[PDB]
Amino acid sequence: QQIDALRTLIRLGSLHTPMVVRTAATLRLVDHILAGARTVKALAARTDTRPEALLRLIRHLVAIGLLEEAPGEFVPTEVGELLADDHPAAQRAWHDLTQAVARADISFTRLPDAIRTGRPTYESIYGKPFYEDLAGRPDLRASFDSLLACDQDVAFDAPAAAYDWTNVRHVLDVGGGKGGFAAAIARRAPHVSATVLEMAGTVDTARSYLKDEGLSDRVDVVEGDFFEPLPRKADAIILSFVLLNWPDHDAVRILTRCAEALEPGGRILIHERDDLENSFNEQFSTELDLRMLVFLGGALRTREKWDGLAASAGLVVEEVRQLPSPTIPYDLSLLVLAPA
Template sequence: MSEEQHLAAIIDGHITTQLIASAVRFGVPDLLKDGPVSTQRLSRATGIAPRELTRFLRALQGLGVVEKAAPDGYRAGPLARHLQRDAGGLYGQALLAGGDYYEAWAHLDYSLRTGESAFEHHHGGSLWGRFAESAEVAAAFTRTMRTNTERAVDEIFGLYAFPACGLVADLGAGDGTLVAGLVSRFPELRAIVFEQASVIEHTRRSLEKRQLGDRCEYVPGSLLDEVPRGADLYILKSVIHNWDDESALRILENCRTAMDGRGTLLLIERAMGEDNPREAAIRDMVMLVLFGSMDRTAREYEELLERAGFMVARTVISSSGLSLLEARPAT
C-alpha cells in the first residue's frame, strides 16, 4: 500500500466507524452468534431489505465482522464476538463512536479554537447529562468503562497493595468492575459505590449479577458536590482526566473534606508521556473533544493533588503507562 493509499484509508475512517456502529445497532453480531443465518432470515430480523442487506454484509465481510456461508447466508466473522450485546467488550464503544461521540467530533475545530468541549457545544450539555436523558447512552458508556477496567485490573492489583479489610470508596465506579475485583479478593473488605443517579442502577445490577451486591453500599451523587465520608481508602480511577483543572481541584478538595484528615486517596490514570505516544496523543484529544479536559503527566497529577491539600506519598508508573498516585491529607 502506497503512502497515498494508506492516508486515504485513514481519511475514510468515518465510513468504517458507521459500518460497525450500524452492525451493532441492527444486532448483526448477535443474530450470527449461534451459527450461519440465511440472508432472508437476517432481512426479516433486521428490517433491512435483502438487496441493501447483501450490500451491507459484503462491506462487513471486508472488515472481518461477518463471513459468507453457503448457500445463501452469513456467519460471524473473527471480530463479531467483540461486538455482541452481552459479551462483546467493544459493544458500548461502537454505539458511542457511531452516535453521540461521532457527532461531537464533527465539531473538533470548535474545541481547537476555544479549548472547550465539542460534545457540550453540539449536544447542549455534558456527556454526564446525556446519561439522564438516554439509558442507552449510559449503558453503552458503563460497558466501555468495564472493558477498559478489565484490561487494567490485573495490572492495578500488581502495582498496589490494597487493604484486606476496612471500607473502600470507589468514586465514579462505572459498572463496579474494580469494586468487584476488590471485594472478591478480600472477603473482609466492604465498599461504597459512588456514581451518578443515572448510572448507579447499572452499577448495582452489575455487582448483584456477580453476587457481590450485599458487600456494597450504593450512594448516588456528583463528585462536584460532595463525597461520602468514612472510608479508609478512596479510589479515583480514570476520573480526574475527565475534568479541567478547576473542576478537578474541586473534586479532590471534596475528597479531602470527606476524609477528615484520615485515610488514603488512590488516583489511577494513564499519564501522558508514559506509554505509546500516538495513543496518548489521541487519548488527550478525546478528553478535549468530549470534556474540554486533558490528560496530564504524572507530575501534573501530583501538582493537582498538592494544590488540593494532599501530600503525595508515592507514585508508581507501570511499563504500560498506568500511573497510581497514593496521597494523604496534608497536615
Template sequence: MKTTKTTQVDPSKIMQIGTGYFATKTLLTAVNMGLFTLLAKSPLYGQEIQEKLGLHSRSLYDFLDALVALGFLNRTGIKKTSIYSNAADTALFLDKNKPSYIGGILEMSNNRLYPFWNNLEDGLKTGLPQNETKNNGKSLFETIYTDPVKLREFIEAMTGVQKGNFIAFGKEFDFSSYNTLCDIGGSGGTLSAHVYLNNPHMKCTSFDLPPVESIAKENLQNMGLSDKVDLLSGDFFTDPFPKSDVITMGNILHDWGKSDKKILIKKAYDALPKGGSFVVIENLIDADRRKNAFGLLMSLNMLIETAEGYDFSTSDFEEMTKEAGFGHISIMPLTGPTSAAIAIK
C-alpha cells in the same frame, strides 16, 4: 561505486487513518444492530442474517465480508454459500449476553459521539463542546442524568470501556494493608465489585449521584454482590468523600478543568488516612506526549463532550497530587492505553 539507500515515502498510513471511519462505522453499525450477539447463538448463512436483521440484499455481502476482512467475523463458503461466525474477540467481548461485553462504549459512540466529532474543527476554533450542549445549553451530565435511556447507555459505555482495567486493578494492586475503599463516581459499581471479588476482605463503597443507584444496584444483583458492595448517593463536588483507606476514581478527573481536578484531588487527600492511596484509572498520557495516541484522542473527545475537561499526563498527575500534599507517586500499567496512577498520603 557507492550507492545511497533511500527511504521510500509511503502514503498508506495517511490513507488508512484518513479513511479509517469506513471501518469504524462498519463495526459500530454491526454492534448497534446486534450482529455479534445474533451470531453468538449459532453461525448463520448470509441470507439468514439478512432476514433476522432486516437488511437489504444490496451490499449484504460487502458488509459481512468487510467484517471478515477486518477480522471480526469468520466465514466458510462465499456469497450465497457463506456461513458466518464470530471471531474469538468478538465472541467474547461483543456478545451482549456475556458479562465480558464491552460494546456499551461502541453503542454510545455510534448513537451519540460519532455525529459530534464532525464538528471537531468548530471545537478547536471555539474551545466549546460540540455535543447536546450546542442545542439546548445543558451540560453533558445534565443532559444524560435527566434521561433514563441515555443514562443507562452512558453507564454501560463507561463500564464496558473500563471493565478490563477494573479487573486488572482488582487483581494487581496490593490491598493487603487496606480494609476500605470508596470509588468516587462509581457509576455501575463495577470497580468496587472487582476489587471485592479479588480481595474479599475489602469493604467497598461505590459513590455516585442518586439517579445512578438503581442501575448500580441492578448490576451488583446480576453479579451476586448485592450484599457485598455498598452504594452511597451524593455529589462529589458538594458532599464530603467517605473516609476510606483507598479512594479511587475511574475516568472521572478527565471530565473536568484543572481547578476542579484540584478540588477533587484535595477532597480525596482529606478523606484518606496517612499511608492511604488515591488511585486514578485513566488513559494517562505519557510525560513526553508522543506515545499514548488514544489518551490524546480521548482528550479531544473531552473537548467535544465537556466545557473544560481534558486528559492529563503522568507529569500533570504528579504535579497536582503533590500540590495537594501527597507524597510517593507511582504508575501501574493496566490494559491497552490505560494506567492506574497512585498517590500515597
C-alpha cells in the same frame, strides 16, 4: 512510492469505513449471521433493512476483511467474530451507535471547533452536556455503565493488589461506576468496608451488582454529587477514571473534596493513565485523550501535570505503580496521593 503514500492517506482519511463498522455492530449483523441467517433476504429481515442497501454495506465489510462470501452467503472472519455480542472485549457494544460511547463519538464530526475553542462539542449536537444528557436518558445511562464495567470482574484485580489494605478500615469509591473496584478490594481484604458514591440510575445497578456478588453487607452505595461535600470520611479514597473527564479547575475541585474527606493517615488513589508507551499503546491514548476533549473537555495527564494538580489541592504524589490490563493490552497506573 507515491501510489503507496496515496493509498495510505485515503485509507486514514476515510469516514465510510468506521461508520460501516459501527453500522454492522449496530444492526448486530454478525450475531444474526452466527445465528443462521447467512443469506441476504434473511439478514435484511433480522436487521430490518433494505436488502439491496444491506448488500452494499456488506460489500465494504468484505473489502476490509470483516466478512467473506457460498454465493450470497456471508461468514464473519476472525476479526469479524469480535463483533459477536458475547465476545469478552465487548467491541460490538463499544461500536453500537444506539449505546452511549459510539453515540458520543459523533462529537468528532465537530473536531475543528474543539481545536479552535478547547471546548467539548457533544452539547452542540445532543442538546445537553454528556452526564446531563445521560441523566435524562436511562437507556444511555445504563449502556454507558455496562460499557465501562464490561470487564469489571477482572479489570480491578491488579490495582486492588497494588495497594496495602492492612491499615484501611473504610474505602470511598468516588464516581465508582457499578462498584467493581469496591468489590475487588472487598474480595482481597475482608476486614475492609466500602461506600460507592455515584449518580442517579447508576446507583441502582451498583446496588444490584454488589448484592449479586454477595457483598451487600460490606459495600454501601450512595447517590450524590462529588462536587459537594462527600458523604463520609475514609482511609482510602478512590478515583478510577474520573479525573480525565474534567478540565483542570474541576479536577482540582474534586480532589479538594477528597482531601477534606480523608482520615488521618489516609490516601487518595487515582487509577488512570500516567501518560507517556509503544506504537500500539500510543493510539489508544491519543483516541482516549481526544474523546475526553470532544465529549467532556477533559484530558489525559502526564506526571508533571498530576504534580501540579496534586499541589493545587494541597496534595503530593507519594508513589506510582504501573499496572497491566487483562482484556485489552494497555498499561495503566495507580497514583497514590497524600496531604502536602
